Design a protein around this ligand. Structure first.
Ligand SMILES: [Cl-]
Lengths: 161, 166
């Protein structure tokens, strides 16, 4: 596959439901992200996440050629304001080299996030001068739900002694 | 026993200027003190240093001039700027509290997945209803707290990735 084709995909499959602002050289792209809850259902099948549960991020990354030493980042924010959560393979100490074509990257995180509506952001880059390959802001929406309501975004219910 | 005028005087006297505390309320009862244990029993500093994910104990000393029923004792955290990133109370926890005259001790615990950074602690005492809500002692912010993490993450949610791909 070629960069021009990827540039076309990048511009076409932009998510307007979230008003996705997408940019990058698109030498490789975040082709798709499927999100699993701990019961094995996808967000598509069931669009909620319970506060504190194990979430799995199933990426498909599509590259026109081999690219070494890339960073694949994921983050979440409220409808407004900066990210409330974010991390990447670089932080986690796992080096990634993209091979030509379609390939699978899987992340996990246990997210103690309070009830509410959030936005998921994803970024692909080569970490020489840094190269932004494919930034997807926001890539999709997600709603969290809890047994009861807390202040803020941290899910940490009090225990009365 | 203890009068409201005395509680008013303690309220003023022990306002925390170091945190620029804004403090108000009728002071029929006050949050006389909050002390924070890392739950294994030690007392943390004036500025507690807590690891992301640790269980933390909040030990309130409450002073009441008379009996007050239907009490809300809330606690929350913010960054130096912005609204609270975390907060809860006995009301949320479905635990009723009645204050008796004089001094008494109320204890909360929570396990706080909060990223490394400097934060501010707020706490508030109020009579819930039985008419109109009465603010007894609101303390914003009453002390500082520092979190540290094994490695730095974005935002305030402590939730490091596991990379399954290898
Ligand atoms: Cl999905």
């Amino acid at each position: 596959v070629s960069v021009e084709e990827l540039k076309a995909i990048q511009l076409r499959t932009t998510n307007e439901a979230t008003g996705e602002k997408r940019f990058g050289s698109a030498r490789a792209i975040i082709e798709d992200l499927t999100i699993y809850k701990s019961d094995g259902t996808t967000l598509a099948e069931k669009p909620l996440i319970k506060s504190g549960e194990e979430v799995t991020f199933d990426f498909t990354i599509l590259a026109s050629e081999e690219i070494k030493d890339i960073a694949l980042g994921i983050s979440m924010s409220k409808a407004q304001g900066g990210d409330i959560w974010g991390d990447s393979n670089i932080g986690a100490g796992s080096a990634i080299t993209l091979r030509p074509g379609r390939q699978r990257i899987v992340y996990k995180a246990t997210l103690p996030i309070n009830s509410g509506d959030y936005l998921i952001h994803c970024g692909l880059a080569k970490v020489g001068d840094r190269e932004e390959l494919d930034q997807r802001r926001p890539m999709m929406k997600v709603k969290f739900w809890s047994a009861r309501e807390l202040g803020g975004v941290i899910h940490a219910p009090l225990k009365i002694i």
